[model samples]
Target chain A: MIIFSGGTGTPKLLDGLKEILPEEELTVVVNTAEDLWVSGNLISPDLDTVLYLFSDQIDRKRWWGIENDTFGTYERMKELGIEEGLKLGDRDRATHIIRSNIIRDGASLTDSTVKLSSLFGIKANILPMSDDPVSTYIETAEGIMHFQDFWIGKRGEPDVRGVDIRGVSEASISPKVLEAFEKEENILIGPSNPITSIGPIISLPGMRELLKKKKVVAVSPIIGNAPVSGPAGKLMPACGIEVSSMGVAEYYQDFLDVFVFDERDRADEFAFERLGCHASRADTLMTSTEKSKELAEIVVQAF
Target chain B: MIIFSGGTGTPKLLDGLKEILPEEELTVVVNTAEDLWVSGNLISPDLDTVLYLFSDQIDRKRWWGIENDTFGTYERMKELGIEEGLKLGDRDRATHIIRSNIIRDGASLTDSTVKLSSLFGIKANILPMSDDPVSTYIETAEGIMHFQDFWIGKRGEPDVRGVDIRGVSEASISPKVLEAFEKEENILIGPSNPITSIGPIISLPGMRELLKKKKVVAVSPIIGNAPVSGPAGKLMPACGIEVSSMGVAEYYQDFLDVFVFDERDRADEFAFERLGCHASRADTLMTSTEKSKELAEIVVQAF
Candidate 1:
């Protein structure tokens, strides 16, 4: 099975998938638009999340960084008056430092990801969406800033006017990602912010056209009138999608084969059915490992 | 009073000077030849020693990093298979990180030092010897390597053939040091390794000529026939000076006014006296703040 992963919600869902399926059988293509350079280290939040999760080194409480990680560097940086957008754990910084050094030495992000995964002893294949840089830029009431600055730096407080996947038009899908898609029939888009997380993946030049030929099953991050978490509720309208399970279904409907949503939104199931999209329902909020496994089981059923 | 400092022994000496003198009245010109870029951050050992000491942050046990600092970043980097020459403490890395960022953004090392000192609340002036890049390259049996790699990486185990002060010929004295010299007449060279620590400072173009105009007093790091600590005993021979108090006095004899040897080296006092050099003595191994203050009083009396 192929999974589309992000930094937050998808990682929780991945815990279940790893338990249900063979780790070797899992191919995760992670979003790289959220990656940014901080204090001279390349921080690939999404890629690291999947890598850490598979390696069993992830902080489950925060779903980012290593569990029981020390924030000594970050705290010292604050006292030194260095303004960094994100708080990086000391253990997590090793990955970023190595990755940054690799990229600075002329290796591609995919190459760095391979090296990092090997170091972590991760079994599952984790490929970045693109080898080339593709940063998500959001136009906000304050000004245009990188997705990290808008999301993490300002705490998503500013009104976002528009979203821009800056380098997507020129970026080609990573060769590894292409090969994974070629061999696999099932592409499961995890419950993530559509406008920021899933949007960048589909925005790649040939991505949507390629999806038109595959079995693409998307789980709605939005259940009722808003997203389960993140600024997806505020960002969706800027991208011309209403923030709802039906809106999420409609957003993916043209090329989407199936839509899975929360059981709480069962009353809204008919709206997805009206679009003639094969619809399914379960508790999409994976509050526990059992809940995540339950949702993963329903996702497999949809395919 | 103006002082010449290195990474190790001199910081202990400075502890005394800082206690005896008004913090703002001291100017320390430190060696930059040992500075290098490590893991994308510029590590200035000599300058950091002075700054950390004055700010009451120096790890006195090691006389290198911040007191009671964590090694989380260094430990993390080691596990990631990234070999950084020095073991930088987590709190210590903040200075390096901020310095690297400032230099990366096109600020001079001197500018970065000024900014860092302000952030650390250091009152005494800490000046790097030169604004231009200068590194000490050691000719080891392992082949030519950086001083950091030789000293910290290999624990100074390799056999030394020669020492190269790379970029020293092109390097000029920093303007701040020159300005400080204009007002200060008593220049006290601390009991640091004479060959590696003090050598680089005096080797700067016009630095020796500039020293001739001041009341220059140098405390001998060497006592009897060996240095108090570090590989100085081995290195001084490579620089053509024997590992003894007289050898150190003779090396600085041309411009040296008062040569302060240790009380234990009273037997060798005649050699310095025969050179017609004004000589003084004290128990220079400062094991405590009181011991440091005793030496600092003798150094002050020399002028």
Candidate 2:
């Protein structure tokens, strides 16, 4: 099975996916648009989260980075006037440092991620959506800013007028990512921000065409009129879609076969059907492992 | 006053020099040949040692790095199969990371050093010998290896056939360093390894010619027949210099005005005088602050 992954929401559901599926049998296609350079090292939040989550090294409280990691490096860097917007823990920095070293030695992003995943003892295949660099920029009242600057630097307060993928037109899917789609497999889009996280991967040249032929399922990141987590509420509307489960269905409706949303939004089932996808409802909050597992089952049963 | 500095020996004396002289009046010219890239960050051992010593942040027992620094990052890198030959503490890595960031952003080595020194609250002017890159390589019986590889990677075990300074011939003195020399200042050669630490700076184009006109003094790193600390004994021999106070005098015979050797090697005083330098004897072991202060006083009193 191949699953499209990104942000805090995907890793939360991953805890449930790993419980049901053999880790070695699963492949994760991670969005790289969320990646940024921190302290001269490239940091892939989505890829690192998935790797750390599967390897049981993630700090559950923050839902990212290593457990009990110290922020000595970050605090010191700040004291030295380096504006590293995202604070990396001392242990978490090891991943970026090693990955940066690999890239500096002329390896591609895919090679570096694979090397880091193996070091973290991750058995599953984790592929970056594209080896080519693509960055997400948020167009807001403050003018165009990097995605991290908008999300973290501004605390997601400014109204985002649109989302821009800087290098999407020039990026192509890596061979490994394309191969994952060649086989008849189930493609699950985890609950992530449609505009910034999942949008970049799907917007890549040839990515949507390949994904169109697969049996694709998407879980709603929106519930009770707010994102389950993250900035999906502001992002969905900024991308010119309604801020609801039906909007999520409409965003991926071109290739989506199944649309799973929270049971709390049960009234929206008819709206999902209008967007041309089979509607399925379950407790998608994923507040606990059991709830996540139940939601994972609902996604699988949507077939 | 300007002092030539490198390795563990000079920092030991710096602990004493700071006690006797006003830090703001002092300038240190540090050898950059011993600097190396560890995990993509430029690490200047000599520069860092001088900076840390003056700022009161140095771990005196280890003769390097900040006090009570954790090696979490280094250990993790090693675990990931990175050849981090020189281990950097978590807090110490901050200095290198910031320096690397500055250099990557197009700042010169001198620019990065000045910025870091100010951040560490150093009062004295700390200048790298040259802004240009100059790497020290050891021609060992095994083969030619980087100075760090010979020192730390091989534990300084290989017999020294010769030493090579890769860019010394082409490197020019930075304007600030040249200005420091233009002042009517007393130049002191600290008790550092003459070949690898002090040699690179003096070997730079026009460096020796400039020093030829200065009032310079030398402090012997060797005592009785052995070095007080570090691989000076092996390095001096590899460079074809006598491993004693007398050999140290001959090393700087052409430019030196006064020579200070340990009282334990007082018998070599006459030989230094024969080399046309005023010979003085004092306790140069610097085992305590008082001892370092006494040695500093001797250097100042040498006139």
Candidate 3:
């Protein structure tokens, strides 16, 4: 099955997905909209989150950066008067440094990720949305700023008006990703932000149409009136979608064949089923390892 | 006084100089011919060595990098397939990060160093030899390679034939360095590599002419018949200078007023005096804090 991964939420679900299926049997289409150069290295947050998740190197406490990694470098960089705007772990910097190195050596981001994946001993296929760089910019009441600056740099304080995946219109679905879609049997849109994380992937040229023909199963990031984590709740309103499970289902309704949300949001399940889609329920909050695996099982059974 | 510093030996000497003199009384014109971007950040080894030395952050063990700094970042980068060719400490990476940040912000290398000096709460002026970038490439039996690659990557095993400071011809002496020369009464050419470290500083246009007027006192990096550390002994022959205290004095003889060799190499003091350069002696090893201060007092007295 194919998984549409984001920075954190989906990786929690993937933690359980890997337990049930061999990694080689899965393919992840990661969102690169949030990628940006921090200090001097390109940090692909979503891609790395998934990479670390599968490699067992992820900091399970926050589900980003490396487990037991030190932040001395980040603190030092801040003290030196250059706040890279991310709490990148010392070990986490290795992935970014090498990625930037490969790019400088004239390789594509896909090639860079492949090299990183190989180093981490990742068996599953991890593909970026596109080779063409696309930045997710939030049109805020204050001004348009890249997602990281809005989210991390400013602590997501600005009222986001709208979201723009700059260059998405020109970015084609990467050949590897397109090939994965054609060859894969099922697609699982893991619990990730709808308008920003998964938004950039599905918005890519020819991405939605391919999903239109596939058995797309999605786990909702929303659980009641709020997202499980991240700025999805705040950002969805900027996309004219309600900050609820019903809104999440509707946003992906075009190509979505199955929707898996919190059992607590069963009120919206009937509504989704009536909208020509199959709806399933689960304890979607992956707060613990067992909870994460339980939700992954529910999503897999739903697919 | 001004110090022409290299990566290690000079920094050890500076550790003691700060003990005897007010930091504001000194200026260091460091070699940037050895500076290069490592894993995306500019690692100004000589400049940072001096900067850290004054800020009490110098790793006195090796006299470079931050004392007590971790190497998690460097090890991680190596694991990720990019050996940056230097064992950069976590806190040390901070200095390099900000330096690169300032340079990318359209500031020259001199401005970058100034900003770093201020951040480290350093009072002494730390100046790059030239605002313009220059890289020392060692042409060895194995073919030409960057100084770091030749020295650290290959461990300096190849026989050196010549050294080239790739942008020194067009790179004029930095304005601040020139101003420091005009204002300062004494210049301390610290114990550093004569061929590559001190060579680039003197090679910059109009640098030697300015030094010719100053009471330039130099501490020979060489002791007995070899350099205290580093490839100076191997590199000096490439420049047609013998590997001894006499060679270091002769290289700077055109402008040098006084030469300080190690007490162990006092035999060469006569040879230096015959070259019309005043010769003095001290322990010069700087292997201990007391030893460093002893040499610093001797050099200050010689000045």
Candidate 4:
């Protein structure tokens, strides 16, 4: 199975999928729009989240970074009066540091991620959506802020006007992505931000065409009128879409075959069907691994 | 006044010098031969030692890194099965990270060092010997090894055969170094490893010429047949020099105006004088800041 993954939401699902599936059989295509160079190291939040979650190193409380990681380095940077944005946990920095070294030494992002995943004992292939740079820019009240600056630096407080995924037009799908789509593999879009997360992945040239030929399903990250997490609520409205599961389906409707929403919003089945996709419901809060597995089961059932 | 510095020996003297003179009056020309790219960041041990010593943040026990710094990053890198050689403390990694970013962003090594030094509130000018990469390689019984690999990775166990300062001939001195020399200032070579630590700096093209025109002083890092610390004993012999205070004077005799040795080796004064350099004795075992200041006073008195 192939999953388009991003941020903490997808990792929660991957954590559950790992319990049920042979990890080696899964292919995770992670969004790279949120990746940023911090202190000279490229930090891919989505990629690290997947690696940390599957490796049992992720801090469950924060759904990011390593478990019991220290912030001594970040605190020291602050003491030095360096630009104090972007806090990296001491142990978490090892991921960025080593990956940056590999990438800087001429390894592609996909190659570095695979090597890092192997180090984490992950058997699954975790490929970036594209090896090329695809930066997500959020147009907000202050100005155009990089997705990280908007989400992390500004705490998503500013009113986002829209998002611009730069370099997507020039990005080529990784070979694994092409092979996965050519094999007509089951494609599941996890509960991630539609504009800033899934947007960058599908907006790439030939991506929508590839999805159009595959068995594609999407799990709604939006609940009643708010995001399960992150800036989806603000970003969805900025994209002129309603902040609901229906809005998430609408965003992916051109190529989506199935839509999964929270069981609490069963009425949305009619809305999804009207958008020409099958609808399913499950407890998608993913408060526990069992719930995440149950939701994964629903996605495959819909497929 | 300018002092050529490297590693712990220089910091021992710097700790005392700060207590005596205004830090601004001292210009430290630190050796970059020992600098290495660890986990992607350019780590300058000599520069950091001088910075930490003056800032009072140095781990006095090790005479490197920050006081009470944690090694979470290094420990995590080890757990990942990455090369677990160089040990970078959590707080100390900040220095490397920021410096690497600065250098990668096109700033010269001198500019980065000055920026870092200012952050530590250090008034002394901490100039790297050169902006270009000048890696120090040691030919040991086990074949060739980078200076750090031999010193830290191998624990200096292998017998040294020869030394190579790659890129030194092509390295142009930074403008600050030229200004320091043109002023005909008093130059003191710290009691650092003669072959690996101090060798790369003086070996640069035109460096010997600059010293020949200055009032140059040399401090012997060796007492009797042993070094104060580090692999100076092995490296000195590898360069075919006597492993004694007398050997250090002979190595620097061409440009040497004065030689400072430990009081225990007061008999070496005549040996230095015969080498055409004035010789003086002091309690050079800087076990405490008080002793370091006392030695600094003696060096100044000789000048």
lDDT for each residue of candidate 2 in A83-119, tens digit (9 for 90 to 100): 6667788788888888888898999999988888878
Candidate 1 i-RMS (Å)? 1.6
Per-residue lDDT tens digits for candidate 2, residues B1-303, read 898999778878878888897888889999998787777778898898888888888997888899988887777777777766667888898888888888999889999899988888898999999888889887877989887777677777888788888988888887799987876568888987787788888888887777788889888877884453467777777777877767878988778888788878546455666888787788888889888888888888987
Calculate DockQ per candidate and list them.
Answer: 0.58, 0.62, 0.62, 0.67
Best of the candidates, TM-score: 2
Estimate candidate 4's alpha-carbon lDDT, on a 0 to 1 scale.
0.82
Cand. 3 Cα-lDDT: 0.83
After superposition, which runs of candidate 1 have C-alpha atoms over 4 Å from their true positions?
A: A77-83, A225-230, A266-276, B77-84, B225-230, B266-270, B273-276
> Tens digit of lDDT per residue, candidate 1, span A167-271?
999999999899888978888888888878888998898888988888989887877633445578788888888767777788887788888877776565667
Sorted by lDDT, highest first, which candidate order results?
Answer: 1, 3, 2, 4
Per-residue alpha-carbon lDDT of model 3 for B1-303, expressed as tens digits?
A: 888888577878888888889988988889989888888888888888888877877776765577899999888867665667678888888777788888888888999888778877899988999888899998877888887778777777888788888999999898988887887779888887787888899999988888898898998787784444557768878888877777788888799998887778557346777779787778877787778999999888997
* Rank ordering of all candidates by DockQ, starting from the highest: 4, 3, 2, 1
Interface RMSD of each: 1.6, 1.8, 1.6, 1.5
lDDT of 2: 0.82
Error of 1 at B177 (Å): 2.0
The number of the candidate with the highest lDDT is: 1
Q: Write the per-residue lDDT of candidate 4 for residues B135-206, one digit (tens) a residue.
A: 988876689978777767777788767888888989888788887666647998988877777888889888
Model 1 error, position A107 (Å): 3.4
**TM-score versus the correct structure, for each prediction:** 0.92, 0.95, 0.93, 0.89
Candidate 3: regions farther than 4 A off: A77-83, A225-230, A268-270, B77-84, B225-230, B266-274
Comparing 3 with 4 on TM-score, the higher-scoring candidate is 3
Clashes of 4: 0
